[PDB]
Structure 1
Amino acid sequence: KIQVYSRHPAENGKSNFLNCYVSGFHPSDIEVDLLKNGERIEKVEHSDLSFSKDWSFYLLYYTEFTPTEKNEYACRVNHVTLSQP
């Protein structure tokens, strides 16, 4: 019963990693405006500019929150497993 794992690669050249895992709320490049350029305007009343009310990554009610997770968030993962019972 002989198991042999041999790994000798030759990686020639630089390696670049960027934004390997992006999640959640992340909008970008958004513009909300009213009367950006206005002249000879008599009255401006009851203006309501709203982007959001409440930010809650977890919002639970009477919840049995029971996750069992084994995750690997990375850029370069090397998950090697040998088993010889």
Structure 2
Amino acid sequence: MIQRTPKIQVYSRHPAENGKSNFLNCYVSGFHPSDIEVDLLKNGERIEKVEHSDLSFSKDWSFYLLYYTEFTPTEKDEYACRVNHVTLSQPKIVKWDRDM
């Protein structure tokens, strides 16, 4: 069975502004099978009560999901998305970069 590894993007809903409420997004797409584990991290630790979209798929049948949480970015705080999937030998961590 052909498996496809997830593409991962981590970004904010609005342009990032220190001290201003915002949304942190982790968008996972292009993957198969659909079983996937996604955590959003604040300074290496898991953020609680993170919401996600209902499973759907692209025209090529590959799956996508959006994981999201309200957050207030600061100069000090580091954010990331941690993703595990059958295609990954270990969890893939993608750091949030306000420039991307």
Q: Name the TM-score class by shorter chain.
A: under 0.3
Secondary structure, counterpart of 2:31 in structure 1: coil
Q: Which has the larger radius of gyration?
A: 1
**C-alpha displacement at 1:41, in angstroms?**
0.9
Aligned length: 85
> What's 2:80 paired with?
74
1:21–1:74 CA contact under 8 A, matched in 2: no
**C-alpha displacement at 1:44, in angstroms?**
1.7
> What's 2:32 paired with?
26
After superposition, the Cα gap between the structure-2 partners of 1:45 and 1:10, relative to the gap in structure 1 and judged at 3 Å, is: closer
- The structure with higher relative contact order (CA 8 Å, sep 6+) is 1
**RMSD of equivalent CA atoms:** 26.1
After superposition, the Cα gap between the structure-2 partners of 1:5 and 1:83, relative to the gap in structure 1 and judged at 3 Å, is: farther
After superposition, the Cα gap between the structure-2 partners of 1:24 and 1:63, relative to the gap in structure 1 and judged at 3 Å, is: same
After superposition, the Cα gap between the structure-2 partners of 1:66 and 1:27, relative to the gap in structure 1 and judged at 3 Å, is: farther
Name whichever structure is richer in strand by fraction: 1
C-alpha distance after superposition, 1:9-49 (max 9, x if no partner): 99999999999999999999999998899732111224234
TM-score by length of 2: 0.13
Secondary structure, counterpart of 1:75 in structure 2: strand
TM-score by length of 1: 0.14
Identity across matched positions, percent:
99
Gaps of 5+ in 2: 1-6, 92-100
